[PDB]
Amino acid sequence: GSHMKIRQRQRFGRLELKRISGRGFKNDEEILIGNGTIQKIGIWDGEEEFHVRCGECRGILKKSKMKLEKLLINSAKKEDMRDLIILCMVFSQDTRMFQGVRGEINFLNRAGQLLSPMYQLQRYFLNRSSDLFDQWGYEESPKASELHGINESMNASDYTLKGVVVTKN
Ligand SMILES: Nc1nc2c(ncn2[C@@H]2O[C@H](COP(=O)(O)OP(=O)(O)O)[C@@H](O)[C@H]2O)c(=O)[nH]1
Asked: Which listed site, 33, 46, 92, 168, has its alpha carbon 20 to 30 Å from 116?
């Protein structure tokens, strides 16, 4: 439907979600993507908390408008952690995710049909993940030792992708 309901499993392609709290309101906005093209996109506004999964990787997501606030992941198979992080970055509509679009991206297919902007961004980044990580930035990992940082190669690290933390497991 239109909005993800508390406790309801939902899909955004490869990302699975399930609301813990909050409400979003969606408004259309002209967004500048890093391409230099300006595209009309449905921007959610409000604080939202979700359970998320990509394959075997689980976590909890907090967002606000156009910002991934916090993402706590449970340790898992590396490919899945990497995609869960990408899918969370796109799902949150973070200003930095928009900036990382470098190459051409289509919002219309060759038959001239209408494609989903958020879906097409997910497709662009699952395939060119670098292009998001370039924009993302690092911060000091959490002081506690039940919590670790992770870098874009998915190894534990003393500096971590901003807002991202890992628990074992
Ligand atoms: N933050 C947030 N995003 C949602 C919610 N419900 C759906 N979405 C996402 O909002 C986007 C909807 O975009 P799309 O399906 O292309 O529909 P459009 O916005 O009507 O053009 C998708 O990426 C969904 O995963 C919600 O409750 N909160």
From this structure: 46
